[PDB]
Design a protein around this nucleic acid. Structure first.
Lengths: 80, 682, 77, 203
RNA sequence: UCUGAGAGUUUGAUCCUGGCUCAGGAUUAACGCUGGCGGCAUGCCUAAUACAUGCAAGUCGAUCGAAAGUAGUAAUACUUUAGAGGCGAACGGGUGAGUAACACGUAUCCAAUCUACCUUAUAAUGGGGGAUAACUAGUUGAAAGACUAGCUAAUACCGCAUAAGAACUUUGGUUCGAAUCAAAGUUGAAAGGACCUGCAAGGGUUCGUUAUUUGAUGAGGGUGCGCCAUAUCAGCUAGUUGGUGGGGUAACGGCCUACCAAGGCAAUGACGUGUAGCUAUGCUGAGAAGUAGAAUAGCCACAAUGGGACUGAGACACGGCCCAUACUCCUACGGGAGGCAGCAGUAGGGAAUUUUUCACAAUGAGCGAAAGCUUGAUGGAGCAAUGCCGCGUGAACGAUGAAGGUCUUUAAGAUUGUAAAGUUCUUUUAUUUGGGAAGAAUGACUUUAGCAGGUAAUGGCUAGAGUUUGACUGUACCAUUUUGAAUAAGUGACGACUAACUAUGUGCCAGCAGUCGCGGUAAUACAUAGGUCGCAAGCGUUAUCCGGAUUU
């Protein structure tokens, strides 16, 4: 994780699965704070579409969060 | 996994040249049926390297050597790392629970077996007798048993007898069992029993008489059976011997020639049967730390308890701490604490150290001896507890060596790294002390013969890569010269931006009643009072260095008879500057006599080797014309000079075969003869 | 540490031998074409080298370069 | 020192007091000279602007029981916002918990207030408070954790004190509220704050 | 709202040029005295010196033969890997010796570059053959193993045929060094597995194979400008420079080769030498600028030293392969095994910088459909006053100054000092008893209902509930939770530079110091005593760069 010990942080960041954490990437989609979870997340809701449309699917641990936000419903429109 | 009846902690504790090293070597050779030793077949293909006794004993000693038998696994230890030492065997017999001492058959005065025998007699720890020499000259059984019984008086009960002379040994007798025949030579790898003939039946009856006659103190029903004559079963009589052993009042003797390796397995059977198990004997009754020093013990239960006794050093690993696991089946890897020092000593790997390799066992059963790796702050005496149990300190007797050798290395950086190594060595293996005196800078070390310092230099150079040569004892002497009449101290120089002057005349009188005192014989006041006190101190600052070499001038009086100075000149320091000048000149004329430190030597002697000791003392310039005995043993007091006692230590050690030790005390300082003062300067 | 590296140590040698065989027949066809230039040799080179270009032995770039350089001398008649 | 344990010496040397005046109660001589033994006719050896700047700095700092490094930290945070920093330093210093605690009439001395606060005898915003190093914000209350309301000192000194005009309190329930920022002309002070501003050259 | 502090010193005195030190912050920091406590941050600057032991990337049986087991005459349901085969081991992780040059940084062009695996659509997933490991057998040996014959299977290998589209060459459309679009010749594809519906029938469903088409990703390539010092380094250079043909690189190119031809770069500093990881930035300064480039992040560099090559989309590969060299280890001397600049740890050096630690709970990666497995990345713990920060050693009454030190040296009196003696209040911390969360509602699994090209079904997606994963922790926090100020102060200075003075001893002596300089009988400058001040759980001491310093 990043940020502070006992106060973790992980920015929702657009990147391809090639390198380590906190390095080269393409776009900054947003951020989520697990230290206080009340169904809220910093999401641009627009750039994430461009990130998803060029491959490089996000980290597997955010799929439920994006479904809660409502991004999968509008993303699966391509395969419809 | 194992039953505590099978696991046993025994050992061999014997005098060198009696076969102790040899018997340990060959026991490891023929008992190597466990892969940790494996010496039985893997020592025959390889050539055993024989270098010395020193290096082999250093690199083969294993505080935990486990060997496998039919049902009972043993754990042995070879403690004696010197000619003979008391605190090492103290720690060992304090942590171990089985003693096998061999008897000499080549120089049979038994110098260093008697000491450990008396120690065990005061310790009351189970001990058995075996003899390594049976097929060698001077190794007859009857003479040995008669001599030990007559001299030591321990009420030994030899059980098994050999066959043939002290060189034609060709068969083994067991008094309650059949006879052991030999198919091959040594190595005792084939076992078979045969009935006894009359030629041995006679001695069978004869020695069974002594065997069962003495056991009358155990289970009087056996005495009734002996009165009746009905045959006594082996089980009950052997249980009686077990009771005698645990009571530490009966001591059986075995037979066999381990030097050529005859009679090995029967030794194993006898020692595993006659000696108790560490589950049936209560653990060492040690005194706790609460304000009472009450006896406590965990009885091989869950609480892990351990007292550090051995700490060795090894490169690539660090500190290997040989400690006894008195109770507790602990885990490999934990953080234990000791209360007497308040630090969590790290438990990283609980290992067993073998002659040729190491083996870290995951868990060790209670009542065992083993090493631990790490333990960066371990001192002998701390209690290792982390299962919520109070600490303990077992203390009944301790001794520190006084046999002193004063040496010095040959290089300064060599001395520095020697100090760095010896501090750690003292931290790990307490068996000697270290003194540094401000005379010139010398290491006064505590030794036990030359072998101790040889072990020192070996363990230093083979590990730390140090070049060092030992030195000779160098000591000083006090000084006192003749009472002079007058001295002429002149200070003439135009320096200091002013006038420098001083004219001193002192009759210098040494005294032995009181210390230094200054006397002013300047009645007319030709010198100022304010100029007296510094130059006084100058003599007090010059009483540390004489005119010859700087020998201590102690308790000497000064009386300023006459003096003069310059009214506007004669700086004060020049006075004291002159004070050392004139004192030298007349001091050269005075031809001082020395004062040697005379000491008292108390030697306890059995009054059978006093001739050599008395002659050596006479040669060492002493006063002896008789003896003064403590109503059963003679403790002679002798006045000795310190200048030659260092060699006299080992001379007395060798003259009495190491049987008589002494203690050094500071008597006083006495007048010297001319044969000492002619050596004052080169 | 490592447990299956020897698998690749023995795996590549036989595959390398097979690839050497493919390369050798390719070079044999190229030399045959170089001896004299005609349509049948070029066709044989195509039919026996396109399979090599299919798999991971020689990339298609080198194959294209080789056939272009062959059809050049073919058209130089 | 955070807990000097001896304030009368400082009062005698500085001629000032945290209260109005209670550090001279005729227990022997009532002398306004310097303490110790240095001669009653000597004053000092160097009396430049540096000396008086340091004297006023120590006066202001020891009037609040604060350490110098924390004072420098406070000055650093003061440099963030701008305005009339001369009186703003006083306003921010008074916003510390124990200062307003005395301004509430709770306890006569800041040291007593610190002793009360640290041992867990004060409640604020439903959270236990153990330090007076809290930057008070306009519109905040302070409770008393009614279990510890049985302290005799605060009960006795609630009425016998003086309430500052920029703070209010319902002393019957022993809870006070911060009204507005403090002012220079409403509190007893004569400190040349400009010397304090100029002296610290770390920034 | 914002941007600049001075002082001392050479001379009888003064001015002036010029130099040095002090008054400021700070670290990859150390030393001496000490010494409550939490959070955060940090911890080989030197020897790219060797390194003991264990751990450091494996995975796939829902890919295959062979081999064991649980129960079952047999079929079988499941767990396993020695091997084959597939994917991944080219990532992640560290270390700064060389490199003073398109390496880095920056804007760019690839009418010169590949891009497996992820996203988009599409021509499709046709048919045979021969193979060899494990195993069986025989030698050798301590194991180690290797060697030699026999049998097997596939998504391993090699052929047979069909191709949209591709590749290749001729004809015609067509471009700001080359490219579009038509007709033709030529030529190359593979491989199955799991599941459902069916009596068989076939079909469908999921993974995946092969030829494509799409972007994106990542890497490569050359140029503009910027990017250390040195003239006590004047000429450097021969594949060096250029044309032609061929080879070769992933592509373009003396990148290589055959012939031919002889310049290129330089006084605007080549070339040689010395030093050096670069960049965002840390620090200082108001700034122009100076300094170092520790964490952290991007790039290249190397992996005992030096050469090569195979493998695969991706290497000339931190712990793949061969050789040489140096070193090192074991051996029953037949022969083998090895590279901590991966994590801790050891030796040595240095003044000096950590424990031979707990788990994948969170994140990522690899494989697999998944239950899941590996993860020395990582999350933690612990040490280390190493730094920053809050935080304590209590708080309120209580003398003409308790005793006593010290001073007044002459007492009368002052001072230590409301500090104390004593009274009251209280427990951060401490000691004991209890409750004891969040970090994780993340991923699957199972029951419900719906959606979709679709069917008879099964599978993919979303909505709902339940199962659970926590190493940390008996953490934090609180609780008629017991006791009681109780369990808790140092370090520098006191002539002026820059804040606070007196006595005693010391007689150019012992001794001081960053500067002025003190001490030859009274030292406020030495030693010490009392008191005082400057900081603070730290205080001072030396070394580094900055400010002061318009002292480049």
């Amino acid at each position: 994780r990043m940020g502070r010990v006992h106060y973790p942080t992980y920015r929702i960041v657009a990147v391809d699965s090639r390198v380590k954490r906190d390095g080269k990437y393409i776009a900054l989609i947003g951020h989520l704070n697990p230290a206080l979870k009340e169904n809220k997340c910093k999401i641009d809701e627009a750039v994430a579409l461009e990130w998803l449309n060029k491959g490089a699917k996000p980290t597997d641990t955010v799929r439920s969060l994006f479904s809660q936000t409502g991004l999968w419903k509008k993303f699966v429109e391509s395969k419809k | 996994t194992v039953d505590l009846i099978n696991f046993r902690n025994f050992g061999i504790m014997a005098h060198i040249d009696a076969g102790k090293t040899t018997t340990s070597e060959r026991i490891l050779f023929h008992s190597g049926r466990i892969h940790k030793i494996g010496e039985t077949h893997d020592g025959e293909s390889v050539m055993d390297w024989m270098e010395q006794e020193k290096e082999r004993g250093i690199t083969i000693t294993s505080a935990a050597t486990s060997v496998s038998w039919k049902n009972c696994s043993l754990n042995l230890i070879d403690t004696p790392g010197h000619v003979d030492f008391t605190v090492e065997v103290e720690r060992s017999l304090r942590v171990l629970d089985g003693a096998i001492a061999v008897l000499d058959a080549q120089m049979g005065v038994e110098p260093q077996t008697e000491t450990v025998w008396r120690q065990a007699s005061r310790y009351e720890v189970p001990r058995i007798i075996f003899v390594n020499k049976m097929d060698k000259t001077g190794a007859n059984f009857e003479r040995s048993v008669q001599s030990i019984q007559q001299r030591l008086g321990v009420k030994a009960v030899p059980i098994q007898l050999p066959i043939g002379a002290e060189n034609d040994f060709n068969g083994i007798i067991d008094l309650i069992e059949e006879k052991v025949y030999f198919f091959d030579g040594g190595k005792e790898e084939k076992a078979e029993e045969k009935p006894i003939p009359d030629q041995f039946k006679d001695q069978v009856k004869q020695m069974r008489a002594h065997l069962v006659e003495e056991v009358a103190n155990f289970d009087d029903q056996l005495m009734a059976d002996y009165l009746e004559g009905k045959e006594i079963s082996i089980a009950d009589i052997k249980r009686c011997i077990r009771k005698g052993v645990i009571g530490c009042q009966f001591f059986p003797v075995l037979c066999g020639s381990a030097f050529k390796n005859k009679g090995i397995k029967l030794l194993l059977d006898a020692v595993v049967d006659f000696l108790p198990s560490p589950v049936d004997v209560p653990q060492a009754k040690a005194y706790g730390e609460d304000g009472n020093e009450v006896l406590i013990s965990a009885s091989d239960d869950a609480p892990f308890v351990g007292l550090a006794f051995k700490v060795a050093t090894d490169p690539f690993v660090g500190r290997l701490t040989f400690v006894r696991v008195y109770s507790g089946v602990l885990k490999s890897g934990s953080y234990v604490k000791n209360v007497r020092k308040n630090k969590k000593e790290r438990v990283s790997r609980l290992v067993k150290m073998h002659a040729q390799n190491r083996n870290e066992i995951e868990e060790i059963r209670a009542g065992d001896i083993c090493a631990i790796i790490g333990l960066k702050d371990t001192t002998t005496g701390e209690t290792l507890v982390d299962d919520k149990i109070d600490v303990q300190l077992e203390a009944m007797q301790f001794a520190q060596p006084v046999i002193s050798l004063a040496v010095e290395p040959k290089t300064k950086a060599d001395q520095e790294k020697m100090s760095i190594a010896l501090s750690k060595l003292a931290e790990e293996d307490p068996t000697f002390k270290t003194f540094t005196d401000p005379e010139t800078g010398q290491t006064i070390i505590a030794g036990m013969g030359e072998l101790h310092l040889d072990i020192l230099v070996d363990r230093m150079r083979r590990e730390f890569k140090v070049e060092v040569n030992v030195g000779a004892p160098q000591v000083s002497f006090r000084e006192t010269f003749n009472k002079e009449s007058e001295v002429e101290g002149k200070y003439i120089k135009q320096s200091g931006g002013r006038g420098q002057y001083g004219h001193v005349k002192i009759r210098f009188e040494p005294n032995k009643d009181k210390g230094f005192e200054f006397v002013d014989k300047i009645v007319g006041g030709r010198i100022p009072r304010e100029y007296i006190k510094p130059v006084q101190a100058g003599l007090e600052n010059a009483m540390a260095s004489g005119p010859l070499a700087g020998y201590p001038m102690i308790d000497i009086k000064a009386t300023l008879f006459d003096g003069s100075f310059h009214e506007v000149d004669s700086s004060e320091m020049a006075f004291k500057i002159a004070a050392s000048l004139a004192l030298k000149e007349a001091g050269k004329v005075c031809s001082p006599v020395l004062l040697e430190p005379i000491m008292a030597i108390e030697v306890t002697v059995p009054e059978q080797y006093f001739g050599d000791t008395m002659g050596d003392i006479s040669s060492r310039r002493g006063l002896i014309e008789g003896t003064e005995q403590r109503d059963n043993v003679q403790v002679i007091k002798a006045k000795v000079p310190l200048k030659e006692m260092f060699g006299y230590a080992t001379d007395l050690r060798s003259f009495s075969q190491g049987r008589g030790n002494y203690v050094m005390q500071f008597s006083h300082y006495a007048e010297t003869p001319k044969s000492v003062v002619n050596e004052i300067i080169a | 540490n490592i447990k299956s590296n020897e698998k690749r140590l023995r795996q590549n040698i036989k595959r390398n031998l097979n690839n050497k065989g493919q390369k050798t027949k390719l070079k044999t066809n190229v030399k045959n074409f170089h001896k004299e230039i005609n349509l049948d040799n070029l066709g044989n080179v195509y039919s026996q080298a396109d399979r090599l270009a299919r798999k991971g032995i020689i990339s298609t770039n080198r194959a294209r370069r080789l056939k272009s350089r062959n059809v050049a001398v073919l058209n130089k008649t | 020192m955070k807990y000097t344990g001896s304030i009368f010496k400082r009062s005698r040397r500085l001629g000032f007091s945290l209260l109005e005046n209670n550090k001279e109660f005729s227990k022997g001589k009532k002398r306004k000279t310097i303490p110790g033994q240095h001669g009653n006719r000597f004053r000092s050896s160097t009396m430049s602007g540096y000396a008086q700047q340091l004297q006023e700095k120590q006066r202001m700092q020891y009037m609040y029981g604060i350490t110098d490094k924390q004072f420098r930290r406070l000055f650093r945070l003061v440099l963030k916002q701008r305005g009339n920093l001369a009186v703003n330093l006083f306003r921010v210093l008074e916003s510390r918990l124990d200062n307003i605690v005395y301004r509430m009439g709770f306890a006569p001395t800041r040291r007593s207030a610190r002793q009360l606060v640290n041992h867990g005898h004060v409640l604020l915003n439903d959270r236990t408070v153990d330090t007076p190093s809290i930057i008070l914000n306009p519109g905040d209350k302070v409770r008393l954790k009614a279990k510890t309301i049985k302290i005799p000192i605060v009960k006795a000194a609630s009425e016998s004190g003086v309430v500052s005009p920029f703070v209010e309190t319902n002393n019957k329930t022993f809870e006070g509220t911060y009204v507005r920022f403090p002012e220079r002309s409403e509190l007893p002070a004569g400190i040349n704050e400009s010397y304090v501003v100029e002296w610290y050259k770390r920034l």
